[PDB]
Amino acid sequence: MDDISVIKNEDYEGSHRFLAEELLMPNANKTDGNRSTMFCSHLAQAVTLQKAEPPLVYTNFENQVGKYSTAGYRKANSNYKVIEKIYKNDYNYVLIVQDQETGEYTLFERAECEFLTEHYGFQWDNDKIDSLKKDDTIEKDTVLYKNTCYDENMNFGYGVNLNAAYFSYKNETLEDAIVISESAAKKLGTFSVNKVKVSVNTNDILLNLYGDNENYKGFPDIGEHIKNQIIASRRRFDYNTALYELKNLNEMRDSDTPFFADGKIVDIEIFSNVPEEELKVQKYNEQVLYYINKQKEFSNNVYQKLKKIVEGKDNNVSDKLLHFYNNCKMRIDENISYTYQNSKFSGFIMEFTILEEEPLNKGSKITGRYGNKGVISKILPDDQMPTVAEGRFKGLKADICLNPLGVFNRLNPSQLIEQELNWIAKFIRKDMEEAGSNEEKVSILLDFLNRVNKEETELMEEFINSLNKTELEEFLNDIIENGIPICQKPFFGNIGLDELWELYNHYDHIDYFKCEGISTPLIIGEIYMVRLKHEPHSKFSARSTSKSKNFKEHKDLYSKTPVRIGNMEISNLSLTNEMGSIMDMLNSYSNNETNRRELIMQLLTGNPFDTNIDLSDVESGTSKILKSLFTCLGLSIDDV
Amino acid sequence: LRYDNSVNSISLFTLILRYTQSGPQSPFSSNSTNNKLRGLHPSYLGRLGLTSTSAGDPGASGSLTPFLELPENSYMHFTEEPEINLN
Amino acid sequence: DEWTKKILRTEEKNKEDIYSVVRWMINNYLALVKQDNMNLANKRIRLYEY
Amino acid sequence: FSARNVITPLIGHPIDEVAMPYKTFAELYKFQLINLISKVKGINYNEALKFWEKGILGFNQELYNYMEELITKTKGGCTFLLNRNPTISIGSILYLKIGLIKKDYKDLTLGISNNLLSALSGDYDGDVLNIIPVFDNKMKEHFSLLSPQNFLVDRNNGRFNGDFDLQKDQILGIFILNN
Amino acid sequence: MISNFRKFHGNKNQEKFNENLILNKENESILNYLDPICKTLEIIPEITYL
Amino acid sequence: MGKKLSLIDFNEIYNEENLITRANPIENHEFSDDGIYSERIFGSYNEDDDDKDIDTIGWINIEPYYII
Amino acid sequence: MEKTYNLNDILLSNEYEKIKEDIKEEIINDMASKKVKYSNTSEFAKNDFLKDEFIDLVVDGETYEITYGNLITLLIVARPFNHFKVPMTEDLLFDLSDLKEYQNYYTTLLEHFGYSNEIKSIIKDVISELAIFSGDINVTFGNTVSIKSLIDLGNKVKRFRELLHYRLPNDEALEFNDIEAIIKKNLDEIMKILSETDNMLRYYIDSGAGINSKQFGQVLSLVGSKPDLFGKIIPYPINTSFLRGLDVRSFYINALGARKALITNYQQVRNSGYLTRKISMLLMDTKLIDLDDCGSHENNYLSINVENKDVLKRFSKRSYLNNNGELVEIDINDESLIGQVIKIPSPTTCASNEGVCRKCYGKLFDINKDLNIGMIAVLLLTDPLTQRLLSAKHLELSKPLREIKDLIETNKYIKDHNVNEVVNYFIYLLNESGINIQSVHSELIIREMMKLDDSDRTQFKNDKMPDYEIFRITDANLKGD
Amino acid sequence: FPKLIDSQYFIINGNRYYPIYQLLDSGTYRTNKALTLKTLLMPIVLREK
Ligand SMILES: [Zn+2]
């Protein structure tokens, strides 16, 4: 509506009720709406980080976001007791438990990775569930497995804190470009999990890519990483009766279908529609047989253990346990014909689950909570980055360097406030470390926090007075070395121009850092940084003459989708006023098959370092078909 | 229904509290040029997210406020009563 | 239908039957035509219905 | 013989020269690459393809050496056309040279000079540019009229084109030097 | 340590999310909407919805 | 459909050699040399030996009768 | 540092690169040795930097006082004279501290050495070397941004503090124009205070790198009034700076704009581009002839009205009929021709069927001969028009773009007006829209649209104007048959 | 009918689908020359002349 007089600030004062995703953004009143909406987009585009940290400057709603976003953690919902543990793989296993109140029998599943979509996934901290053994009670709110986002006390982190300085690094930090320390890039690490299906029919066999002559292994094992980005390759045969192609195991050909991924496979699920005796005779199936047997061994194992509970009259089983039991029973049961896409399939279909630690690489996009964007232009050694010299903070190196030009134009001032607060906090930490008793340290801490956030100061006084002297010393050391928590609420409770002004006036010793080779003094302060989903790999295309969807089906390493030339492109090329060469490129590259063959042949038969191509003048195949059909139509072109 | 295209464990706003004006029976349409519907309204404060939307289809989808209180006995209506009192 | 009666937010006398609803709409026609489409008071969220 | 790639800023190299990822060069110049491997190692064209297939999977110095030799020793250099769509302006398609081949398999970004960006009108925001290599020496010469060097002159005025002039970071350094 | 303080502050926020809104999907009942859809059939005299 | 373009006089361009006057799709378990699928005039899979392109066009004779 | 440098002795020496190398190395090593000191006041602080120390430069016997930094910039940008071994006249020297002039110096280099590919290569090497040194300057001198930088200035300069904490008067008498006036007054002061004080942001303000006026003032002083979804200015202004914070009411107004920007970009997807193919088709065949004079009559020469300063700029590097004589190049800098209709040789009226002559096209003949002349024209007009249409949607500003299209793509104005009136209408339409094209390119488009009723190409030398009929761009293609 | 898993999503045909709320008008929605109340079967529309 036009009327905004209805909005009265006194009504919404002290409440963040009007904020949603921006509850994760400090000093949101100071950031523009455009930057805020970009931040909201980035949070969904954010990728999981192995070494995620709770933000140094926090809004205090982050833990709630971790709590109510259930995809990252598994919490027991009742008191349980561990009946038994069954293993399918070293990495994948199931735990059967009984409700201590209902008596219902339920199960919990353990796996290394969680697959979300495409390549996106994350590894699990499975410490607690792995600790559990038979006849061990699971308390009501225990967390069996957690994501890397959550910590020991279930604090939530979507990014890492990196020391940042606004500096013009050899023009590498141009526009939204960033230079990162190699150690810092190690901190910003993601996982990639892929579920890849290879379908081998009766006439297809898998080449011995991972095996010797004595032992035939055509695909990686559960504990082995993929080599050369090839899981397996299938050769289709016209008739598998001869079995003469035993000698062909090592070689590869273009006709063979190759399946591409990199990482450690962690689970194999095989769906077989072939009788066991038919499979056993051939040695080339040996590896497959093992996993098939293993699956059956797992399934049978659950069936024997749970048959009394499920098929007993009481049937105090959860629906999950019932369906798991039924599926395993179907697997062991004969006359089980597996159908994929509503059709019965020959041979077997294998699903590999592959987990890879994907590191930060050039072209990756990283951001802060304030809508800024950055692309990693260069990763440089720690020594090459700005390092302050001849101070109490001597040898401190900046993890990331950001563009100073245009910072105010972005209309997201809050990133600077985060930097200033962590930088001033460094001085407070050194002041605590340098001198005093524990009481002096808490006094300095409480004064600084009183300057920043009164609520944090009050709660910290309570928390500190609660602590024992040993615990107090440990907490103080944690603050000195790891960092200091500072609370900057989104709208109500953040500091401003006047408060930072007072902070700078009181702390006269705090002044810019003098770096080693830099004339201009610099400020180095920690900023919270997040890793975005975009990487160059998504849009890479490269094509050489002989969508296909093979790449989506993992049959091609990279997309070979052709680029399109149109009338606009032809006009811009026609600027040269040499139309014949443009037509030659079009015919040699696309339209004319004869000229295309000539180009390929000449490129491979001519001198490597001197290439001159002569193309024959011939009507294209499309033109020939057009003339033939038109003459049948009864109309003929007169070169009008 | 919507596929889980999530790249994150963070689900509170991407999926749990997400709303869409677009639907099978939708007053909202691209051809209808519902530019007003894509915009914000003062009632949105405290109930809907002002800055949460998708650049591809702005205003079609957004995030519900974590603190939103839907009145009990109003069948998931934002207010117990409509705009005009009629009394 | 019973569902529209439950959703509707007017005195039950006006929701007893189709005639009561038509009477309520006609009597307040001028006011109801002048109501904001985007006011969240005049809107709701549904999940399982569709 | 076409490609799509993201653009990343390049420093320290001439404006016309660019840096191309390992995967990008291998596919576009595959047949040229196979020719050298067959000649150097005296192998059949199919066997040379096997060497190229092995190189595609991961960085190997040997295939990098064949790629480095091609960019170094080819007549006229290894050159291509870079277009940012929509191709509505002069300088949208540019004739450029492959100065360097990247040694990081993961790096899949084309390295371009900041001065070229204004002519293309693109941004380093994740936009992708189409790469169409030109092979024939005759075709190379004709498309050299689309080179950045020829476009230093504004066609309407005849004056120098600011599109290829110093940009934000570059201007500041010269300003501190002189002013 | 720091983690214990951070959890302590998070629990003492005083601004708490509405659990009923986040978990309303579980507390919504299909029967409430199913009953009227079935009772639309009751127009036929033979059919009565139990 | 409806276009203004030059018409062709079929009789002048007609070639008696590639004339399909045999209607049989197959002859004695073989593709008819006079059939519509004729390797001699139209070509075959071994097109490089044939030296006969897609442009090869067959003819049918309605003589002594004329059609619109 | 040495205190006397002979320019053309070093340029024509074979130690040209070594001299630059050692000076370049000396300047960056000095910057690494010392810090920059800031006083945050009008009495600047003293710094001992070699780039700011003075040397004497001798150009053909004349000594100019030039900074060490201006010397190394001059040597890098005077690479042409080392390559060609031709000395640098004093005419070519320019202010090395105003980077705007570099563009014009490159232009004089192109004209002096003949627009050759060799001089085109050297300019590219000069731009490259200049940029690489800029990175060395930037990584050694350093550049930073901070709120403490703002605080440090305001602690000394009260006006900065008062502007950094400015809040609008709460009179209801203030209006949108009054508030916008205060925005410029306090922002123009802010930029002046930053240019006149020793602060960490001084080089940004003077260089113009990474500074946008509106967005700079919203962070530092005041955001101001903002439009709603449909363009109406909301009665309430935002009386804060982003640095100081925002109000809940203000947060809704910002979100309205950010949403509006998103909706607008969704509408902006429309890009017909139909005219681009039409204009390209007619003009692709037009070529040039190496004939100095086609032969045309002065009444057949085109007549144009120099009503505005924008009009003369469009006709540079082209011929003009002086009152005393004939066929002298029009000087755009002379404002004497303002308000005078002038007779110009036009590519429309060129007699030769093969191409347009050197006098009718202009002095761009040798410059643009390598490229296709017609295609140069279509891109110079299309790229602005396509971009201007999209940029206008965000804000009578859109009307010039439509009339430009109607002029060439419809017969509304074509069928009832002469070419002399048509081209002048075209330059009027370009001036209002802001499109900067030299008139020769626009006239070439009209030249092909113009189809002779008489159907004789060489009749232009006859004093009588040939009978003709202008046509619509799509109709002219259709008229070929 | 699909069953809720983990309190916010559905698993069907091997894929993870999440239900999202829909924003709709409560009733008595305005339309050109008309006022309409939505019903399950036939919407009740008042048209003016
Ligand atoms: Zn002429």
Numbering used by the authors:
A (entry chain C): 1 to 546, 556 to 649
B (entry chain c): 398 to 484
C (entry chain c): 299 to 348
D (entry chain d): 248 to 426
E (entry chain c): 1 to 50
F (entry chain d): 1 to 68
G (entry chain D): 1 to 395, 511 to 596
H (entry chain c): 101 to 149
The publication says:
Here, we explain the mechanism by which the phage AR9 non-virion RNAP (nvRNAP), a bacterial RNAP homolog, recognizes the −10 element of its deoxyuridine-containing promoter in the template strand. Promoter-specific transcription is performed by a five-subunit holoenzyme that, in addition to the nvRNAP core, contains the product of AR9 gene 226 (gp226).
The Standard and Large unit cell crystals diffracted X-rays to 3.30 Å and 3.79 Å resolutions, respectively. The electron density in all datasets was poor and displayed a large amount of disorder, which complicated the process of atomic model building. The X-ray structure of the core will be referred to as AR9 nvRNAP-core-Xray. In the AR9 nvRNAP-core-Xray structure the TLID has located roughly in-between the β and β′ pincers where it partially obstructs the downstream DNA channel. The TLID carries a negative charge on its DNA-facing surface. Similar to the negatively charged σ1.1 domain of bacterial σ70 factors, the AR9 nvRNAP TLID may function to inhibit non-specific interactions of the enzyme with nucleotide templates. Out of 10 independent copies of the AR9 nvRNAP core belonging to two different crystal forms of AR9 nvRNAP-core-Xray datasets (Standard and Large unit cell crystals), the TLID is ordered in only one molecule.
